[PDB]
Structures are given as structure tokens and as C-alpha cells.
Amino acid sequence: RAAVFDLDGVLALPAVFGVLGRTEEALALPRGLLNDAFQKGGPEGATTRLMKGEITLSQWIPLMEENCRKCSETAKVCLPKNFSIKEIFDKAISARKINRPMLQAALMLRKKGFTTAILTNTWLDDRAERDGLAQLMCELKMHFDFLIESCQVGMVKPEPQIYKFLLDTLKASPSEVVFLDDIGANLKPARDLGMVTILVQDTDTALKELEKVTGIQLLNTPAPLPTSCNPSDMSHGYVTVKPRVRLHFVELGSGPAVCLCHGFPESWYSWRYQIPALAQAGYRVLAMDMKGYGESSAPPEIEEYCMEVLCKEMVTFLDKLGLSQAVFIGHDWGGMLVWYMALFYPERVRAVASLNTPFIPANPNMSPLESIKANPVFDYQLYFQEPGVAEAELEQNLSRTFKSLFRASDESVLSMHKVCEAGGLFVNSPEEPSLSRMVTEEEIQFYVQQFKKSGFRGPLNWYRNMERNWKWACKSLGRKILIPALMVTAEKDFVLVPQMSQHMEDWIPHLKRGHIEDCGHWTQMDKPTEVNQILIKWLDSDARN
């Protein structure tokens, strides 16, 4: 079973082709006068050549104008003084956007064992504004197994050849493929070939039919999770910031550099839901594998993990990448790291954003270790102090450790307190942990395999520099964070509680905020949609300028 969608008028609206009709009416021109100068010539027409990739769009423009002149000459009418076919198609193409519901129906079908493809009569775009279309096509590509463009294969609908090609690349026979098109002319060939067709006028009737023919609910359906990313399809980057310290990161998109810094015990993969979104939103996302994790180096020494060296290393990272600035977005320990980046390296930080982790300036008086005993919730941290211990149980069974940790605010399975006293962190925890609604078995295994390389020694060392981080932080008490900053609190984070952030404006005057209902500690996985929404609204107004 396979699904084929045309671009114009099906996956993308308003149908660019449909601007010809509108133009005609807006100019009080004979009905179809522009749709005739468009087909003027049939298979041997300038437009068929254009659709076959024979000539470019900029080359087609003039050929179309004349066709508009000659066609207006026969209809005995005259075009407006400054009639511009390029001005009409520019506004038409940029005016066209993805038909969300239709794309969701595609995503759905593919998700339920359907090969999907886009069969479209399109052109080689060389306009100074070709980028706009390149982006749309780029966002659609990733969602379909195939994208057959006419100007690329040298064929064009309704020629029977393009349909034989479709079925050939689809590895399928008709009566096994559904063909959606807003133009009957191009439907016929596919219909006559035996494949199910759907004439698309209105999206909903179109989907009702589709839903009705595939026997799958495509309409009134929930609301998908934002696009996640498959590790193997990501661009992997490696930067040596020091002799034997190499940092790994995932890179996607173009635009201002947005550096994502995960917490404990995570990976760049914890941003799997915002890397695609943030890139699509116009940013060059660099999801980090913080020192001690994944493909980044994991030196054993404890002090290699104090904020001072970690921050000093991020700075070097930007340096080695020719970046003078990057907005830092962190979560948990990464969030702690980001606040200090803004406090110690403002020049390098374009903007700072932190999820769950608030900025509490250090107390020049009471040592850290004490300020951590005064709150049973941070007990587990005292347990991570002793080198060896935590590594022991956390590395004993990786799938168990992660299935146990990555859980929603409700589905908890660990007595977060009375840890040290209880001996371990999984003491009265199931050996066979249930599976969180936030993660699939597959995703958990990604962390398992990722943590099989260096283990928890490096990750845990982040927790073993309280005294050191403290002395450093005290150097910044007279400062204030005066660059764009965003604090995002999670209602149901029972350790990094929203209340701890309440005084942040004292040190971050212009601090902007974000909050998320029923969201646990793993904000990214828990509420990917709302998180993306908050970071993008923020980035677009405070980190782009």
C-alpha cells in the first residue's frame, strides 16, 4: 500500500497554479485568459518544457509573458501597463504554504506502514527568491519516502511515462497505491492504470475519502508529537577543545547559533524534539554531548567537570568553530552551565535560556554541601559524591536505570529521598521498570548504547565540584545577567521546583519566563510541543534582533 500526493493544491495551498484565476478576476480579465497563456502550446508549450526541466523558471517568465500578450490579442483585450508575470508568480509561490492537515495525513499513513511519495510537476527555480521554495520543499521531503519532481526526471503529468516511473520507484502495482491530485487531467492516467485516485478540491472531503479508502483515521486525529530525529540522519561534529578532550555535537539548520546543553544523565538526543523544530524555525542548532557523555570525551578526573573548566571549554568550542557568539539553552546541569556562561562570558552568549534550572547566586557564607543537606530532595546528590558508588548501580543495568529515570511527573518509581540512607537509588524499585509514556523502548536503548561507552563517571563528576563551583561562582556575586535571558519552569518538577526561580529578576532584571503545566523534570521529552513553542517565541524576539 502506498500514498502519492501532488504538491500544488494538495500538500501545499493555495495552489500556485490557482493564482492565474485570481489574477484574471482581480484585473477584470477574460475568464481563463491567463490559464490559456499558461498552457499555450500544449506538450510543445513553454510550460511543458519548463515542467520537464528543459528550461529554468527565469527563462520561462518571458516566454509566458508573450503567451499572455498573444492570448490577450486573440481575446481582444489589453493587459495592465505594468503587468508582471514574475511579480505575480513571486507573490503566488511565497503565498503558498504547507497544507498542514494533508501533511499530517501523509505522516500518519507512513507511520502505519505506507510508502509515501510526492509526485509533482514542478520547475527548476532560479529566481532571486528561490530560497523560499527550497525551504518548503526541504520541510516536506523529510516526511515522504519519495519526492518525484517532473523537471528532475524529464517527465511530466499527464504523460503516461511519469506514472510508470512512479510505480517503478514505488516498487508497487496499482490497486495498491492511492493517487491524490487537485487536477483531474492528471488523475485520469493514474486511474486508467488501475490505481485508486482522489480528486482534491477541499482537504477534508479529500481526507474523508482517503481515510475511507485506506481504513485509517486521518481526520479529527489527536495531534502528533513534533518531528523527532533519527541519530543516523544527523550531521555529527567533533571539536577537540583540548589535547584529549573532544566534544561531539549534532548540527542542523542555518541561522544564529543555538547551542543546546543537556543535563544529567542525558545526551544531545534529549533535544530530539527541538532540534528539528528550532532548525525549521530558522536556527543553526548545535545539540551538544556535554563532556563525559556520548561521543564526547570523558576524562576520569573530577575537576575536569567544574563549571569553570566546562565553561572554559564551551568558549573554546565556539572558538574552534569560528563562532563568536551562540545562544545557550540548557536543561538541568546544562542549565546551570548556561547561567554561568552568561555570567562569565557575555560576549560569547547571544542569549541564555534554561529549562527547570534557576539561577540562584552563591552564598558567600554557607558552603554548598550544607545548603544541599537543607533539602531532602537533593539527598541523592550527597549519594553521588562518593566516587564509585553511584557509578556502580547506575551502570549495573542501563536499560533499568533509564527506564527508571525518564518518567512523567506521575509515573514515578523511586523514593527520591532517603536515598543514601536506603543504600541505593533503586532500592525499592522494580528490576523490570514499566515503560514511560515519554519514551519508546528504542529511544531508551539509544541512551543505553550511548552510555555503554564511558559510563556514569564523567556524568557524575558534574555533581562532585560543589565546593569548587562555589568558589568560582562567588567571583560573580557583584554581577548581573543583562543579556537576553529566559527561565522556563516546570510545574511538576519536584526537585528543580518553580519556586526556586522566583528571585531571578533580582540578578536578571529583564529576565523573560516560561512555564509548563503537568511537566516533570525531563521537560524536553515530557512537553516537546509547548517547549518548542516557548523557545521559538523567545528566540525570535530576543536572540535574532
Added chain:
Amino acid sequence: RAAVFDLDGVLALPAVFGVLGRTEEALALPRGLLNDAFQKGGPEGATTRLMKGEITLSQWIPLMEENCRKCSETAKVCLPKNFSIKEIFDKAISARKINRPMLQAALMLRKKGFTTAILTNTWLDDRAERDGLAQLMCELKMHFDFLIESCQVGMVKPEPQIYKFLLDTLKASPSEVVFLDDIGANLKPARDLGMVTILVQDTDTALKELEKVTGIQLLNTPAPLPTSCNPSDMSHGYVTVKPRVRLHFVELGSGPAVCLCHGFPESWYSWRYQIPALAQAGYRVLAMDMKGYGESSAPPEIEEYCMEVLCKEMVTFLDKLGLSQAVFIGHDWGGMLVWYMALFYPERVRAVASLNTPFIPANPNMSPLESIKANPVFDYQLYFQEPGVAEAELEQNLSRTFKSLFRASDESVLSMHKVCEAGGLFVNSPEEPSLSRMVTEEEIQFYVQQFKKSGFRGPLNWYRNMERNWKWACKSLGRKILIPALMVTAEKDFVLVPQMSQHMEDWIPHLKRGHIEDCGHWTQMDKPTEVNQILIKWLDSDARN
């Protein structure tokens, strides 16, 4: 022996600190009235705190204004209605730029076995325009072994501590270090500590003294090669574009994506002189390791190297990187590849630039193989046809192969013609090739080690798809390249001669050009300076908009 340079007034001019004097005169204010509100308070003054990193620059601003008010109150004068200390320092800082000659003297000293460092009293910059300074500091950093900022170490000149720190990080004793500063006050401590000092007023007297004290010519010196890059300090990226095809690239800088595509038999390293320059010029440079080379995959099959699959793979590369567009700059085979990228994927190409390689549309009639026999210079290509042969001699001795190929237009050592007939390409060539003025032994060894992985099979396959590339290219004969394009010819390229480019405007109407005197086939290594100049002038006017 070591050299220490202050930033303000030595490595960077005009001295920001020097704007206070100018302001005073421009406003007819009492002499030094602003330099007094600046030091107002001595070691306990707002400025010393600022220089120690205690407070940020934005925090210092207000504290400085009042000091200007109070200092004007004592001098019995009043400041202009809208006097802005932030407006004065913004204009002052952005107005400051690297002191080229002084930086060249540093580069030189370092090049001749000198540890260099920048000891500066600076501040944590959090102004909305902190980026401008971050960039300058970023360009200077890379040239000195050390960059000691006062606001970072918590010390400040002329406090004796900062000088003890300097000597400590420098791993050296006085009488072994030269200290350059435009402010005598800060010179004294270093002088009294026994180290050679130079009061900097005018750069030339300063350099004369320096030259005179180190016994090294720093003045009237030639003109260095543009900055090259050390493979180990580059960010390395890997993108899997297909099951077993992974492309490697080097990434540097931010801004529009500029994709560099090397020719045969090279690597991303062949752009070692423009990657730093192009990044500094405001671009995100992605130097590719074309399929078959370096750390990129090198499948053995011949057709994996036809322009169609190669181009299709670059497109996928942009896709996997979230890039909808990139300007493609190619050389030799990479240049051929770039022209086709513009012909087949305009949407993806923001701009196309090619060095040496002209765009000659395919002849629908005469096959490629024939059109290659009609020119003794392309004889070597007929020799690369037979799988095995060329691989044999080119892989026999890598250092010899490269030392033999990478040579200037004059220092040739191969009978470029009568190759097949002569049996090999190195027939009457020295086993012990001389060393080209374009490459060091070290750089040659980089190519040697790079080619030890996959050899010349993949590289050579690029030459084995003439017939296939031809059929494909013929699909584009009706097209024209209407996107920004640049053709750069090399006078002394005796194979890809400047004359072959003369009709390019026929298919590329708006084609812009570039030419380079006494430049051989390896344009990048041969004339790095002029090449950088041509590409940057072009990029800034045609690929940025």
C-alpha cells in the same frame, strides 16, 4: 624568549581609552575631565572593579556617568544635555580595530620560536553590541599562545600580582620577556620586575625598538601568507548521505553557508588558506572532502562518481544539514561539480564560483571521449580510464606523487603530454622530487596520510564517467545559469586555460569574473592571498544580498 602585548593601544587602535581625550576636546570640556571620572576612586574605583570582572560593562556605565557628573561638578562645568557614556564607548569600541602591523610583528615573533601573549585590562562585555568586540578578540586569540584578560583572572594592571601571573603562565622569568604597553604606568611594574619593556606611542618606533631588542626583522617585512589551518584544530563533521556513503567536511565561521569543493587529487585541506579568511569575512565555511577522498566514503564502483550521483549527494548533504541553500565554490573537478549544481539544483545553490574550471556545455553530437583526444593536454585523462593503472603508479609512492603534482607554473617536473604513450605519468620524473615553494614537507605529508586511507580509486573514478556525465549534461543544454556566478581563471594553468572560459557569458549572462597572474593549476596554494580577495569581494556583493 616571550612577547607580551597589551590590547588597547598596541594590538588594537585607536585606543578605546583614548576616546575620553577626544570627547573632552570635541565638547570643549576641561582637559582630562573624562579621564578623571574614569579613574575616579583609584583601586577602589568603579573602573578597577570593572577591570577585575567584579561588575559588568553595562553595570559600570551608570557608575561612570555619575563620576562624570561629580568630576564636572568640581571642575565647575556642565555636560551636554544628552551626554551618553554608552554612546561614547559604543562608538569608541566599534571604532577600534586590529593594529595590523603590530599583529604581524607578533605573528612573526611566534613564528620564530617566541611564546606570545596578550596581557590586557579588559571587561566583561554585555552590551547589546558585545558581538563586535567578541569577534575582534576572537581573531586575535588564535595568533597568541596566551590571552590573559584582567576581568577574567581577577587581577588588573598595574597591580604586581597580574605580572607574577603573567610570568607564571608564560613559564618564563623576566630578562626573557618583552612587555609592550601604551601606558607607562602599567609598564613600570614589568620593568621593575626585570623584563624588557617598550612604551608604545607610534607603532613603528615601537616595532623598531622591538625589532632592535629581539634581533628579528619585524618591520618592512614581506607580507605573510594568509592564515592557514591546522587539521587538529578544525571542527570535523560527518554526514551519511546514503547507506554506506558518509561525507566528511571541515566547518568554520558563521553566516551564509559556503561549500568548498576541491579537485583531483586533493582534499578539504586544499582550501586551508581560504577557510580562515572566508570565515573571518563573515561566512560559515564547509570545506568538503569530496566522495572518494580523505575521511569521506570511497566506494569502489565507477558510476558512484558521475556528476549525477555526486550532485544528488551534495543535495542530500545540504538536506541532512538543514541547509536549503549554500554557495558552491569549486576547483578543478569540484568546479565542474559546482556548475552542474547550479544547472540542476538552482534552488539549493545561493551562488556558484569555480576556479580554473570553465563551464562548457556538452556537445549533443560529438561524444566526450573524442572531444578529449582533440587536445594533447587532456591525454593524461585517457590514461586514467583503465581501472588499476593510474591507481598503481599514483599509490606507489604518495609523497612523490604529491610533491610531483603540487608545483607552481614554472617548477614543473612532468611531461604533461605523451603520457599514455610514455607508459606512466612519472616516466621521466625524479624519484626524489624537489620541494615546491607552495608546499612544506609537512603539508605534503598531510595529503600522503590522507590518501593512505582510500587511495586513488575513488578520486580517479571521477574521470571515468565522461560518457555518463555527458548524457546527463545534455539534459541541460536548453538551460542557463541565472544565479550569481563567478568564474576565476588562472593565467598559467596550462590545461584548464583561461581561453576555455571565453564563451561562458553565453550560458551565464550575468557571470562575473576573476583572473590571477602567474598562477598555476593549484590556484588555492599558489595565490592564496589574491584568491581570498577575489572570492570575498564576490561573496560580499553577490551571495549575501
